[PDB]
Design a protein around this ligand. Structure first.
Ligand SMILES: Cc1cc2nc3c(=O)[nH]c(=O)nc-3n(C[C@H](O)[C@H](O)[C@H](O)COP(=O)(O)O)c2cc1C
Ligand SMILES: CC/C(O)=C(\C#N)C(=O)Nc1ccc(-c2ccc(F)cc2)c(C(=O)OC)c1
Ligand SMILES: O=C(O)c1cc(=O)[nH]c(=O)[nH]1
Length: 366
């Protein structure tokens, strides 16, 4: 049934697609195809067990699309139709930019992994602002029905003041976002990840929250920080402190890794960039675990990295995540992966004696 669809995509459709197109062309086609909503609605009906209340909002299910698939806000509606409980677009930079030269996305099918070095290719704030404005009341209804929208902000390659880039993003897209993400963890913009250090981070985030707080109350988003899986213990302890001190609304844990775990088999494993997918999974889960402990369970976490199943999702939830995202799993399993994760998650939750997702959040720590 759903298993027959899963198998079709996994064994026939996706490998054929991966044979005809390069990874970037495939990405661009998927965004186009998804934006038209051509694929029929996902059959899976979200149970009440999957509902989460966090970040000032209701999420009808805890499975979202990670930043990077839809950088420019072109496919938001098509992604809700696929069954995602929330959609995050971006990263968006203030001014339009190309990103890095091609080729810049690489598949590692033997590892169920991707490496990318897009470098924040972005239509920029103005284009994305108008795109979101065109569908603003549709989104207001989606959100009220439990399907929120996040906006992930980046910075221009050549920008002098990182904090002003993020501030601009807060000003322009904050009023259109249920939550904002300060992406300080892209491996593909020089200097960016050092925004994660204590002094810079506190200065940056103070400016961001101050700009957010200046928005009219009805258009005031939660602000989250997205961190790398490659942080030192000092880094993490420092982020936890700053986040608690400033009252940051949550964390996204994690971005892609600049590491190359032992055992990667893919021919393209030494390409420069962020690695995503299955080899990232446990490194992300452990980072979630640590950040939840360091913040005493008081700071919501969206868990991301290598989620391709219900077990993967629950592991992150039990480690401390209130919500989860995926992207890379889609490039191997296609759209059916979304219903797969939700069905399996629900089964596992029953099986382990949780009334719903909310009861499982942080359970490993208790
Ligand atoms: C093609 C590609 C582009 C990405 N671009 C962004 C980005 O613009 N901003 C961001 O915060 N994360 C970006 N990500 C990182 C993902 O949001 C996510 O953190 C990471 O891929 C781990 O999740 P995954 O294993 O499910 O794919 C990108 C990932 C990939 C695969
Ligand atoms: C990492 C860049 C990347 O996106 C890919 C690669 N390589 C890739 O294959 N993407 C990719 C390719 C195909 C799909 C997809 C497959 C069937 C369908 F009806 C709609 C989209 C998706 C998808 O479901 O997006 C929501 C993503
Ligand atoms: O645009 C990119 O290169 C990119 C950004 C990011 O945050 N993460 C990632 O893996 N790639």
């Amino acid at each position: 049934m759903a298993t027959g669809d899963e198998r079709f995509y996994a064994e026939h459709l996706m490998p054929t697609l991966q044979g005809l197109l390069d990874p970037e062309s495939a990405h661009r086609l998927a965004v186009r195809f998804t934006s038209l909503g051509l694929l029929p609605r996902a059959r899976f009906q979200d149970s009440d067990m999957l509902e989460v209340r966090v970040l000032g909002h209701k999420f009808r299910n805890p499975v979202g699309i990670a930043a990077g698939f839809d950088k420019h806000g072109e496919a938001v509606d098509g992604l809700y139709k696929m069954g995602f409980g929330f959609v995050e677009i971006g990263s968006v930079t203030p001014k339009p930019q190309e990103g890095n030269p091609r080729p810049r996305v690489f598949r590692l099918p033997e590892d169920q992994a991707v490496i990318n070095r897009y470098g924040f290719n972005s239509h920029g704030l103005s284009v994305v602002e108008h795109r979101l404005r065109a569908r603003q009341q549709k989104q207001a209804k989606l959100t009220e029905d439990g399907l929120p929208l996040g906006v992930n902000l980046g910075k221009n390659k050549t920008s002098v003041d990182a904090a002003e880039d993020y501030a601009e993003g807060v000003r322009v897209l904050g009023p259109l976002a249920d939550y904002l993400v300060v992406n300080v963890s892209s491996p593909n913009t020089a200097g960016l990840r050092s925004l994660q250090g204590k002094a810079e981070l506190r200065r940056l985030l103070t400016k961001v929250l101050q700009e957010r707080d200046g928005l009219r109350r009805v258009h005031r988003p939660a602000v989250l920080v997205k961190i790398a899986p490659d942080l030192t213990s000092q880094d993490k302890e420092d982020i936890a402190s700053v986040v608690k001190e400033l009252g940051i609304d949550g964390l996204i844990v994690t971005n892609t890794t600049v590491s190359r775990p032992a055992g990667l088999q893919g021919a393209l494993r030494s390409e420069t960039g962020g690695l995503s997918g299955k080899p990232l999974r446990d490194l992300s889960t452990q980072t979630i675990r640590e950040m939840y402990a360091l913040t005493q369970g008081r700071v919501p976490i969206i868990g991301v990295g290598g989620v391709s199943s219900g077990q993967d999702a629950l592991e992150k939830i039990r480690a401390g995540a209130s919500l989860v995202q995926l992207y890379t799993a889609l490039t191997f399993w296609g759209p059916p992966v979304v219903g797969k994760v939700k069905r399996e998650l629900e089964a596992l939750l029953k099986e382990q004696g949780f009334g719903g997702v909310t009861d499982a959040i942080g359970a490993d720590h208790r």
